[PDB]
From a paper:
The C4*T (TC PAM) crystal diffracted to 3.61 Å and has a shorter b-axis than that of the wild-type complex crystal (112 versus 119 Å), indicating a structural change in the complex. While a non-PAM sequence in a dsDNA likely prevents unwinding and subsequent formation of the R-loop, the artificially constructed C4*T oligos lacking the paired protospacer helix in our co-crystallization studies are attached to AceCas9 RNP largely via the guide-TS heteroduplex, which allowed us to examine how the TC PAM may interact with AceCas9 PID. Superimposing of the refined C4*T to that of the wild-type complex structure revealed rotations of both the PAM DNA helix and the REC2 domain toward each other. As a result, the three residues that contact the PAM in the wild-type complex shifted up to 5.5 Å away from the 5′-NNNTC-3′ PAM. We infer that should AceCas9 encounters a dsDNA with the TC PAM, it would have a weak interaction with TC, thus preventing local unwinding and cleavage of the dsDNA substrate. Mutation of the 5′-NNNCC-3′ to 5′-NNNTC-3′ severely impaired AceCas9 activity and destabilized the AceCas9–PAM interaction.
Similar to other Cas9, AceCas9 contains the conserved RuvC domain that is connected by the arginine-rich bridge helix (BH) to the nucleic acid recognition domain (REC) and the PAM-interacting domain (PID). Unlike other Cas9, AceCas9 functions at an elevated temperature, interacts with its specific RNA partner, and recognizes the unique 5′-NNNCC-3′ PAM. We show that AceCas9 contacts the 5′-NNNCC-3′ PAM by forming a network of hydrogen bonds with both the cytosine and guanine bases.
Author numbering: 7 to 203, 210 to 410, 419 to 518, 682 to 778, 791 to 1133
Write the structure that this text describes.
Amino acid sequence: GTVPVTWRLGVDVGERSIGLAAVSYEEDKPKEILAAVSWIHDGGVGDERSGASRLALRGMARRARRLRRFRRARLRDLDMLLSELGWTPLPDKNVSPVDAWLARKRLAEEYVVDETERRRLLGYAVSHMARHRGWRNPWTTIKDLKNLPQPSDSWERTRESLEARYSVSLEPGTVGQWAGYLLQRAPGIRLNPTQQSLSNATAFETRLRQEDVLWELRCIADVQGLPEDVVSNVIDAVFCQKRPSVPAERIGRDPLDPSQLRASRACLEFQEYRIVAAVANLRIRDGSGSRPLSLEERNAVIEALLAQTERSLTWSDIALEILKLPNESDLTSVPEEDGPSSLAYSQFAPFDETSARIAEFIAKNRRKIPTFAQWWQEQDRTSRSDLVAALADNSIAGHLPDAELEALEGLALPSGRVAYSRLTLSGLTRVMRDDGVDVHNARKTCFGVDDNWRPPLPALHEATGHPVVDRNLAILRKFLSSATMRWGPPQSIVVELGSAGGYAAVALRDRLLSYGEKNGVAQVAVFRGGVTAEARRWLDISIERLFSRVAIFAQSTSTKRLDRRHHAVDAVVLTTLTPGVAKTLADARSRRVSASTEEPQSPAYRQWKESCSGLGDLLISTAARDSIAVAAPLRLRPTGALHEETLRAFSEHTVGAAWKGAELRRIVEPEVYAAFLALTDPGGRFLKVSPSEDVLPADENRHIVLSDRVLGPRDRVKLFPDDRGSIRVRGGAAYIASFHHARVFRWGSSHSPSFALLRVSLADLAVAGLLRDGVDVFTAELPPWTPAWRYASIALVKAVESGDAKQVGWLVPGDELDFGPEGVTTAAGDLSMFLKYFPERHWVVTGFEDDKRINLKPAFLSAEQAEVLRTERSDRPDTLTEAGEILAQFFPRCWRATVAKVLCHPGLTVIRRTALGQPRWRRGHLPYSWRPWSADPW
RNA sequence: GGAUGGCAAGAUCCUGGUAUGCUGGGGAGCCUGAAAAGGCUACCUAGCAAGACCCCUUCGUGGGGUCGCAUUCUUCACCCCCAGGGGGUUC
DNA sequence: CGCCAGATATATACCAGGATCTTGCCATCC
DNA sequence: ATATCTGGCG
C-alpha cells in the first residue's frame, strides 16, 4: 500500500513549533516537495502566566488532594488517641475565637490544680496545634525533631523585632502567648504574613518551625506535670508526618533484567562490580603483547582496591606498587571488544566508597556504634550487601538496633542510582571472577545476548517526561509513520534545533537512530544550532520574499520569525545537508562575522549547489500553490479543569417576587429551574428570555411544585451570583471552565441560512453526566438546565426549540478556517486596513467570546513577533513601518468575529489536517474537514 | 577529533509538608448608620475539583482504602508493539 | 439601549531532597 | 491568554 520513492526527512525543531518536510531526490537533486508543514504546538504549558507545564499543574493538584486526605487522616488518628486520653477538641460552631491560644498560654504560665478542668483546656490547645503544626524537613523523623534547638534562632529573632516596635517583652515567651496579646493592643494585626497583589503593621516575619512548636509542647508538659508514657505518645501523634519516598515506577529498569530495578550507587554489589569489571578488561604487555591478567595477579590487585579506605591507589601505583611491573605503561585497559586502549596513570583507581564511609563513621563514632562496630567487624559482605541495599531503601523508601540507628543518620552515604539492578551486578561479578572473562562477554554467559550488545536505545513510542520535547516528539513520529506509509523510508534525516533544547537533541536523535537501525536509514544528522538559516541565505532563499510579505521595522530587516511557515521551509532545505557540508557552511559563516570576506567554494559546497540549485524554484512553486501548511493539533480528550477554583456565595430570590430574564437563568436548583421554565412557556423545552427584562410578573402567590416538596410564595430559591455560566460544587457556586469545544447549529434556507454557536464547557459534560466511557462528547443532547443552554444565543435557542436548528458540525480551539480564494468578504473596520497589508485567508479558532462571536487569529503569523511589536511602539515610536502599527494594534485581541458574519461563507471550509499536513476529506474514524454552509446531519 | 577520572551548574518531574486564599459554619474587636444590618480588620472550625470505584460490613444507608486537571486526532473503527499497557491511521 | 474597544479577573507562594536528564569546566592517556 | 466586566459610543 506504499508508493516507494527516494526521499529525505527534514525537521526544524522550534520552541513552540516544529517544521517537517519530506523531499524526494532523483540522483542526485531534489525534484518534488512531497510534504512540508510546520505544526504549532503549545510547548506543554498549561498556565500561560508563570509558565508551569500541564503535568506540573496535575501533580500539584494531585499532591494537594493527598495532602488534604493525609491531613484529614492524621487529625482523626490524633482525635482517636486523645479520646481514651480524656481530652476535648474545639467544636466548630460556637466557641471563643481565642480559646486555643489562651489555653497554650495559661498552661505555660499558671499550674491549674483541678484535674478535670485541666483536661478540657488540654484538648482545645492540642487540636489547634495539630491544625497549625508548622514546617520541618520531611526527611527527618519525630525523634530528630526532638533533638533540635528548642526554640530556634529565627523565633528568638522574630520575638526581638516585636519587642523593639511595640515596646513589650513577654516571659518566657512561647508563640501561643505572643499571639493572644498582640491581637489586643493594636487590633487587626495579622500573625503570619501573606501577599495577594498596603497600609498596616504585621506581627511576624518568618514561618514557625515544628521545633519551636515542640518547644512549647514540652514546656507545658513540664509545668503541668505529665507522665512520660502519655506525653511521648501524644507528641509522636501530633507531629506524625508521613515519611517521603520515591515511587517504584520512577526507578529505571535494568536493561538486562527488566524485572528488577536499578540498584543504588552506595550498593556493595555495585562497588565490587565496578572494581571486578575494571580489572577483567586490563591487559599487560607480553611481547608483542598483549594478554589479560593472570588469575592470581587479578585477585591480588582486586583485594588491594577493596581494602583501601581512601582513593589513593592510582593506575600507576597498580602497575608498580602491587604487581611490581617494570614500567607504568606496561599495563593498559580496553573499553570495547578488542579495541583501542588508554589509561591515565595519574588518575585514581576505584575503591569501595560505601565500606570506607562505613569505616570512617565507625572510626569516628564508635561510642555511638559499639555493638555494630563489633558486629560489622566479622560480618561478611554477603550480608552487608543486603544490609546496604536496605540502607539505601531506608534513606529512601522503600536486624537493626533502634538505639544505634538514630546516630547512624550523621553518616553520608553515596546518593544516586546506577545503570544495573542488584542481582544483575551480583551475577555478573561472580562470572567475571570465576571464568576470567570480559564484562561484555559476562553478559553472554549470564543472559541470552549476542556479543557485544549496547543497551537498547529509547524508542519513538516512549515519552521523555519533558513537556517541550514530548510535544515535538509526538508530532514527529506521527509525521514519520504517515510518511513511511505514504512513501518509502527516507535516505537521510536532518534535524535543526533553535540551552533547554540540549536534552531534545540527544533524546530525539537517539530515538531516531533506533528508528533507522530498525527501518534501515543510512544517515542521521543533527545540528546545533544555526546551520539552516545560513543554508538559505547562501542560496538566495529569503522567506520574506518567498511569500510576498511587507517589512515591519523602520530599518529594513529579514522578517524570519514573522511567518510561521518558515519552520517547514527550513525543514525542506535541511534535506540537502550532510554533516560535513553543514559545518563547512557554518565555518564560513563565522569567517564573516569576525572580520575579508571573500566568497565560498569547496568540493563539498560546489557539489551541494549543483545538486541544490533547483530548490530556488521549487519553493516558489510550492508557495504559489499554497502547499506549505500551518497546523495545530486538536484537544479532544474531555479531561482538565472542570471549573474555576473560586468558590462563591449564592444569591437568594423569593418565589413570590418579580423575575427578570437574568434572574431566571441564575436559578440554581435544576428542578426549580424547570419549574420557572414552565412558568415562562408551558410547552417549551428551553428558556427563550432576554435578561434585563421582566418575563414573569410579581405574582404575590407564586408556587413551585417539585418531586421533593412544593415551595410557598414566601420560600426562597438560591441563585448563582452572576449571569454567567456556572455550576454548584460542594455547596458553592463556581464559574465554568473555558470552553472544551463548540457545537455548530444552523437553520433557515439552504441558500441563505443563519448559523450560531453553542459554547460547551467541561462543566457541562460533568453535570450532564456525559463523562462515562462510550460517550461522544460533541454530539449528545445537553439538558436545558446545563449552562451551555442557559447562555446560548437567544435566536439560537428559539430556532432549536422550533425543531429548525440541527447540529451540523463542531469546532474546537486550533482547527483551520480556509476561506478559499474567495477570502474574507465581510471585511469591515480595522480588519479592512489589516488585509491591505497582511492578505490572510487562513485563520485559527482561539476562543468563543460570547454566544454570538468567535475569536480568530491569523494562521500564518506568529504571536511572538507581533508582541515584540506592541512593546516597540510604546517605547520607541516612529520606528516601525505603517504595517507595523497595523499589526501592533491588531494582535492583542486579534479578531473578534460575529459567528453569523463568519459561517455565512459557502465558501469557507474548516480544515482538519493529517500528520503530513494534508486535509482529511474522507469521513473516516479520524476527524475530518467539512463545510459549515452545505454540511448536513446524518 | 575519540577514551577515562573528577568538578560545577542548570532542566524536568516526583514525594511529603507549611502558610495563605475562597466558600460554609462561627464570633474577638471596630466603623459607617436615629435605626434594622451590615462591612471592616482579624481569628476558630470544615472542605477545596465533579466524581468513579473498592475494601470491611457488625448491614452502620454507614466506617477506610485508593484513583480523579498528564500522555493535544474524545467515543466508535483497524494496523502495530511487549496480557495488560504503549503506538500509528496516508486524502 | 446595541455594539465596539479598552480594561479586568483568573488561587499563590514557599520548603528538603529523591528519580530522570543535559550542559559547562578541569585533567591525563591514545 | 481568555471570558468576563465596565464605560463610553453611536
